[PDB]
Short mmCIF file of C-alpha atoms in Angstrom, two decimals:
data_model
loop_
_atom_site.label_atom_id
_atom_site.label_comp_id
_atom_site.label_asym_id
_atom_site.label_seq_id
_atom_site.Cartn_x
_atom_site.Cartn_y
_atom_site.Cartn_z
CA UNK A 1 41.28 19.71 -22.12
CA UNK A 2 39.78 20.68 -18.12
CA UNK A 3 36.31 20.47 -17.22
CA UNK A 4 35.34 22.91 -15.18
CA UNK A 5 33.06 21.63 -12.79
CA UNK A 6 30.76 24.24 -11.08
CA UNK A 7 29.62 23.45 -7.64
CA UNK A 8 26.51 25.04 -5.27
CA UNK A 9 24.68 23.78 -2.58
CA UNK A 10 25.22 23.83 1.32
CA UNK A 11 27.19 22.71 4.21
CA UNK A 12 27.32 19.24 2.61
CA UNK A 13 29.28 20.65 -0.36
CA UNK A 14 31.03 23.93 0.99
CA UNK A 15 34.82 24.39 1.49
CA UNK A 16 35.13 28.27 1.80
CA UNK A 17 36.49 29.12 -2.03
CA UNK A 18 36.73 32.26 -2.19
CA UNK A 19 36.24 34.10 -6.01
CA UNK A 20 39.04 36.43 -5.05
CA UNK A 21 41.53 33.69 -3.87
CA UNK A 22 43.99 31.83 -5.78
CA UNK A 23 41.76 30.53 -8.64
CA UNK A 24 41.93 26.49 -9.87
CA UNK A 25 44.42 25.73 -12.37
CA UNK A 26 46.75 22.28 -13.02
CA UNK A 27 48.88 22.12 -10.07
CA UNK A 28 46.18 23.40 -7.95
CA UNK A 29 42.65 21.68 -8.94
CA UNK A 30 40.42 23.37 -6.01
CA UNK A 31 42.14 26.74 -6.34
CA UNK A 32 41.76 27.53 -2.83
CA UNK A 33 41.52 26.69 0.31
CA UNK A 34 44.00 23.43 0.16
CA UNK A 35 42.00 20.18 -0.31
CA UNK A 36 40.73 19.30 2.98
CA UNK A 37 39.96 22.73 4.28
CA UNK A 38 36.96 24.30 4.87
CA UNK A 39 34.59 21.51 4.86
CA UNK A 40 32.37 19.72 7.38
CA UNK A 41 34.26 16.35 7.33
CA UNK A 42 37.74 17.20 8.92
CA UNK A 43 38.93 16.37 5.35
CA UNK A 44 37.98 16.64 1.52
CA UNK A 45 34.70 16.52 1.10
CA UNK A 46 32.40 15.00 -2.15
CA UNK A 47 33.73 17.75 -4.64
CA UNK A 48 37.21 17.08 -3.29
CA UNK A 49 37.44 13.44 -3.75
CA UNK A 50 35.53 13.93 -7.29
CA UNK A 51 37.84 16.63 -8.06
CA UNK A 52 41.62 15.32 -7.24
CA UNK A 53 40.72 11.22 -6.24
CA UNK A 54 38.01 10.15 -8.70
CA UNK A 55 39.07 12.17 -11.60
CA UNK A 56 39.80 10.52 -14.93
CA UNK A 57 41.15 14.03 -16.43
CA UNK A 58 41.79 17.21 -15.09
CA UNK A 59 38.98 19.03 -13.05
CA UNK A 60 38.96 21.93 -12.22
CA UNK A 61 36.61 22.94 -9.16
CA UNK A 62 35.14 26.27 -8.55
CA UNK A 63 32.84 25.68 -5.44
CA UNK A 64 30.77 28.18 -4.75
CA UNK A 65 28.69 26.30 -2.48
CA UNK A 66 27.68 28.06 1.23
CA UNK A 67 27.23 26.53 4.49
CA UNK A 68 22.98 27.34 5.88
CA UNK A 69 22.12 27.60 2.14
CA UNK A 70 18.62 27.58 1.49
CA UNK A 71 17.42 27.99 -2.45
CA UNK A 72 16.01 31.35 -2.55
CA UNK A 73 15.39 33.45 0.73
CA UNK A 74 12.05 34.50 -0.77
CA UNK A 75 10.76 31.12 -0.04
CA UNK A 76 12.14 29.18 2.92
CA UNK A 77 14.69 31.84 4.25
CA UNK A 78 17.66 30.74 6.27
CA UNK A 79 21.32 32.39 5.62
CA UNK A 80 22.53 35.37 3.27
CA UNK A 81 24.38 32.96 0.66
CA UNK A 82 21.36 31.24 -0.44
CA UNK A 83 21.18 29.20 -4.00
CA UNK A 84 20.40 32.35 -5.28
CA UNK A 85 23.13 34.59 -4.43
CA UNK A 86 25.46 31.62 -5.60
CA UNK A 87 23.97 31.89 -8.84
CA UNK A 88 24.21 35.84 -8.79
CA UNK A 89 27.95 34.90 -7.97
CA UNK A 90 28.48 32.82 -10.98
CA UNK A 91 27.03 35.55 -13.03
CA UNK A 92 29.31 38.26 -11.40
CA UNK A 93 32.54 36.06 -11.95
CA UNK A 94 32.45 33.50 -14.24
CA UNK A 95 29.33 33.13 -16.01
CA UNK A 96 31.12 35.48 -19.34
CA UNK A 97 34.30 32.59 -19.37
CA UNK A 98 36.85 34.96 -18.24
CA UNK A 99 40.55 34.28 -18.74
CA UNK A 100 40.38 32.99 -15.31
CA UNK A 101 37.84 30.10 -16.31
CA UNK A 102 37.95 30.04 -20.58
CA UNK A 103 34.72 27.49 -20.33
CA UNK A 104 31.99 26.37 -23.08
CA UNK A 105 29.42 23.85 -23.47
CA UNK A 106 31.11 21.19 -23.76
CA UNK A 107 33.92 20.84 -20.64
CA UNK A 108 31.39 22.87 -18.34
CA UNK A 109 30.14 20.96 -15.42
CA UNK A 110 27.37 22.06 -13.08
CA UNK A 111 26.72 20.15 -9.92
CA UNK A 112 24.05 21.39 -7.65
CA UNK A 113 23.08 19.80 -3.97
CA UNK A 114 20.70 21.43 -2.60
CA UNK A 115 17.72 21.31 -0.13
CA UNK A 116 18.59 19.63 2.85
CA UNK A 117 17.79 23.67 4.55
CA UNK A 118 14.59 23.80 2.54
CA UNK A 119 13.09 20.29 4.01
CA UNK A 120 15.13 20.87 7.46
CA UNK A 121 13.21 24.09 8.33
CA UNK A 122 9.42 23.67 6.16
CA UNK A 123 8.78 20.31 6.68
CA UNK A 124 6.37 20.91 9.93
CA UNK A 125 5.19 24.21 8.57
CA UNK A 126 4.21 23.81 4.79
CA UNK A 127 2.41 21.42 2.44
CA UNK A 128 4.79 18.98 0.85
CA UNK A 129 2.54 18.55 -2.42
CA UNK A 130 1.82 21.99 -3.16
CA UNK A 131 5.22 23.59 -1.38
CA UNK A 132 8.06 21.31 -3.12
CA UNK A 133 6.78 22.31 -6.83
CA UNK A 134 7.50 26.06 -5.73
CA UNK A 135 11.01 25.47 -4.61
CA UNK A 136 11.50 22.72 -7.14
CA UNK A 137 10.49 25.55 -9.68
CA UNK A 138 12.82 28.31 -8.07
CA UNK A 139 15.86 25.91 -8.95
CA UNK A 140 14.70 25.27 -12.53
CA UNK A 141 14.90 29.15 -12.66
CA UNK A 142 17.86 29.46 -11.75
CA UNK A 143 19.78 26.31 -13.52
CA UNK A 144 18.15 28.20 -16.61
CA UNK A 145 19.98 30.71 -16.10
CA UNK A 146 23.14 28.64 -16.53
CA UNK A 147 22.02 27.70 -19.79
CA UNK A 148 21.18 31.03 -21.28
CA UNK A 149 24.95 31.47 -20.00
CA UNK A 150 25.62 28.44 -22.47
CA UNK A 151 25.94 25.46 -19.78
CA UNK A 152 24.97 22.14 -21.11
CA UNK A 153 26.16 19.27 -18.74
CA UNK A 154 24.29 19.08 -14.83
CA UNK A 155 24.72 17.02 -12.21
CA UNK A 156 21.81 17.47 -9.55
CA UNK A 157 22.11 15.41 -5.75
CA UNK A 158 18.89 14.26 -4.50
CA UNK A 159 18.50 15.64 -0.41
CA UNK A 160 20.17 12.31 1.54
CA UNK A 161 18.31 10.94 4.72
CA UNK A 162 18.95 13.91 7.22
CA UNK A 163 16.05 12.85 8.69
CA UNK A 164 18.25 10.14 10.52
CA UNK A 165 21.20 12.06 11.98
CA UNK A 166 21.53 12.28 15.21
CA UNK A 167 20.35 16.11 15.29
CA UNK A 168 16.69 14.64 13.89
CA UNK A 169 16.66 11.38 15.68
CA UNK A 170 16.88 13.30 19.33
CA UNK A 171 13.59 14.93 18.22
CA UNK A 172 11.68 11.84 18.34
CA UNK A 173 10.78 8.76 15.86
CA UNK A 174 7.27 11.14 14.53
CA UNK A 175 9.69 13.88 13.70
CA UNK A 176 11.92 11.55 12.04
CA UNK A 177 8.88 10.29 10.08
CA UNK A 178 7.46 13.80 9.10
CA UNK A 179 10.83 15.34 7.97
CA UNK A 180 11.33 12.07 6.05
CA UNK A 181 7.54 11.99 4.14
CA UNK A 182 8.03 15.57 2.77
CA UNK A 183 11.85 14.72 1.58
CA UNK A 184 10.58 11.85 -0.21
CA UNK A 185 8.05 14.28 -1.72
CA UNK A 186 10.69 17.07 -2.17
CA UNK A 187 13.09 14.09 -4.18
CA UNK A 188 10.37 12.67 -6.60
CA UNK A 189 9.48 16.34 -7.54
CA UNK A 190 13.17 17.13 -8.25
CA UNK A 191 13.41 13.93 -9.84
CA UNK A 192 10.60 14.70 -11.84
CA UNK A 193 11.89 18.54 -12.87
CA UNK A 194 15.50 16.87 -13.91
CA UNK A 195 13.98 14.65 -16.52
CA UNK A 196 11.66 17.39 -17.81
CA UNK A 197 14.41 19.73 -18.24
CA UNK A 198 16.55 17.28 -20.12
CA UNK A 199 13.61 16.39 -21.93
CA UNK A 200 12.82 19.94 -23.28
CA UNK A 201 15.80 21.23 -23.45
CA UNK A 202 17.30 17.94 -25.73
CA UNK A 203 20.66 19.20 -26.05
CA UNK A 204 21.69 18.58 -22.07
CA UNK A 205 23.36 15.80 -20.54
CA UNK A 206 22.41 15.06 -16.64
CA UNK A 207 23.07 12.47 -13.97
CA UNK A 208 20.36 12.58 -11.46
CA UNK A 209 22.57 11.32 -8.56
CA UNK A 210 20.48 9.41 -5.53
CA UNK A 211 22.43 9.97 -2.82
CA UNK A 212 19.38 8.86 -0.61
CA UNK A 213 19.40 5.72 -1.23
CA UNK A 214 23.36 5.38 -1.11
CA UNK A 215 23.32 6.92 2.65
CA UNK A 216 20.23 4.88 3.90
CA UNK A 217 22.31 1.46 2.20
CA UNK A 218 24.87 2.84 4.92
CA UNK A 219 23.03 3.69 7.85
CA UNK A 220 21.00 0.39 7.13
CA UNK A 221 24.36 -1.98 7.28
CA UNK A 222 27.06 0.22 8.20
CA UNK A 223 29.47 -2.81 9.66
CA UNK A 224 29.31 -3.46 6.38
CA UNK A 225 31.10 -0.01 5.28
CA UNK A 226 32.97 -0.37 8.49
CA UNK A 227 31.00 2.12 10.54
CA UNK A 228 30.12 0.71 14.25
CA UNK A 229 27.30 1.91 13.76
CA UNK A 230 24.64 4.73 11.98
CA UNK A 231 24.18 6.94 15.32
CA UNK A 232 27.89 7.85 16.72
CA UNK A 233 29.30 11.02 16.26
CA UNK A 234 33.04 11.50 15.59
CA UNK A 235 34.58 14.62 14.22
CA UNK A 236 37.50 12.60 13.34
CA UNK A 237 35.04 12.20 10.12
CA UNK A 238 36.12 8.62 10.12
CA UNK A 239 35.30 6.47 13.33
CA UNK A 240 32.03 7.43 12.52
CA UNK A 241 29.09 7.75 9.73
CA UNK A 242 28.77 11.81 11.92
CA UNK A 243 31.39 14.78 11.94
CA UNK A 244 28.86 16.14 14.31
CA UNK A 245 24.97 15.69 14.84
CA UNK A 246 24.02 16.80 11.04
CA UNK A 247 27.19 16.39 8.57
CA UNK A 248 28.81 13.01 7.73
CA UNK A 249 32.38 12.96 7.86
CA UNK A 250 35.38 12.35 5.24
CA UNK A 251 34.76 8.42 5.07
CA UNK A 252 31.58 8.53 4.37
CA UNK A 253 32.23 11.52 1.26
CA UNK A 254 34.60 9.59 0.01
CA UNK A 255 32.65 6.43 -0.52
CA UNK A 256 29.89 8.44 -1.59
CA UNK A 257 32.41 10.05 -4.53
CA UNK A 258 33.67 6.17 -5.08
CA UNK A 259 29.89 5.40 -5.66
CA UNK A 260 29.15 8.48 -7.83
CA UNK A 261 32.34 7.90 -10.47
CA UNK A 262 30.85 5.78 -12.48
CA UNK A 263 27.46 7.30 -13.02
CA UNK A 264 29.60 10.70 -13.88
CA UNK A 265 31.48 9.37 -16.81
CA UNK A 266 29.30 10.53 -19.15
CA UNK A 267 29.84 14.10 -18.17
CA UNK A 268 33.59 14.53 -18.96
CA UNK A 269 35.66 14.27 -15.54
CA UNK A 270 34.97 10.58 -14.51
#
């Protein structure tokens, strides 16, 4: 009885799994790399932990998630594996429940975090109001795509509050504010699209997962999490809330997967 838990986004979520590698099974939950590789934490990262430290069952994780991933290129444009071509991967590989990955409605898992690219390089340049609904759209698009494959259960990660790592906070406290006033924007329109697809849809179930507010709780009190503080930088990935200036590092992924396993027990794994 596996779930198969589906993963895209960005650097926050990548670890290099490649569709032609050794593919997930029981004695080897992220197929490949080995848990711990790949990531931007010097560890496991969120779909790690969720996959072989939170797990109430067996999960299996296929992560096709792809470090500089914007949603589609034909909107903010950053690096070739965009949302879209992760999607287009899906399709080519898995979407058809091969042998390989024998999935169906109802042990099918699809976790997207995405966005963090989309704000990072528009939110100077565009209209938050008028620009989020287009991207916002784009990734209904393509989640209904998923569906027409026959996927049921989502998880969606709102965009956490890149607008205080160190790589935003050198740029000055007005930056900070302006990259943070269209995110906000950017979360309450995918918060809004999540509960209208559910709603329409009515045979879904989704966790709308606020990882905002979890890492601003940190960086607000992190003696408290046993962080010296929300600024330093430690690739390490545990000194330190920073692996570098723009990815938090293995402690900080874990206790976000800690925080998420009880809001995912409704979707099969947790």
């Amino acid at each position: 009885n596996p779930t198969y838990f589906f993963t895209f986004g960005d650097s926050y979520s990548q670890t290099g799994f490649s569709a032609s590698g050794t593919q997930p099974s029981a004695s080897n939950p992220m197929g490949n790399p080995d848990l711990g590789i790949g990531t931007t934490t010097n560890g496991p990262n969120w779909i790690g932990y969720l996959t072989t430290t939170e797990n109430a069952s067996l999960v299996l994780s296929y992560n096709l998630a792809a470090g500089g991933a914007t949603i589609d290129n034909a909107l903010v444009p950053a690096w070739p594996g965009d949302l879209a071509s992760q999607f287009r991967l899906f399709e080519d590989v898995y979407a058809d429940k091969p042998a390989s990955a024998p999935w169906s409605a109802e042990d099918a898992v699809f976790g997207v975090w995405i966005g963090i690219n989309d704000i990072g390089n528009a939110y100077y340049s565009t209209d938050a109001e008028t620009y989020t609904p287009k991207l916002i759209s784009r990734l209904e698009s393509l989640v209904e795509e998923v569906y027409k494959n026959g996927g049921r259960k989502f998880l969606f990660l709102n965009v956490p509050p890149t607008s205080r790592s160190p790589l935003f906070l050198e740029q000055g406290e007005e930056v900070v504010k302006q990259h943070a006033e269209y995110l906000s924007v950017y979360n309450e329109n995918l918060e809004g699209m999540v509960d209208d697809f559910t709603k329409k849809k009515g045979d879904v179930t989704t966790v709308l997962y606020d990882s905002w507010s979890f890492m601003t709780k940190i960086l607000d009190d992190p003696t408290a999490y046993g962080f010296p503080d929300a600024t330093c930088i430690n690739d390490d990935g545990t000194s330190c809330i920073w692996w570098d200036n723009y990815h938090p590092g293995m402690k900080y992924h874990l206790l976000q997967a800690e925080d998420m396993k009880p809001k995912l027990r409704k979707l099969g794994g947790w």
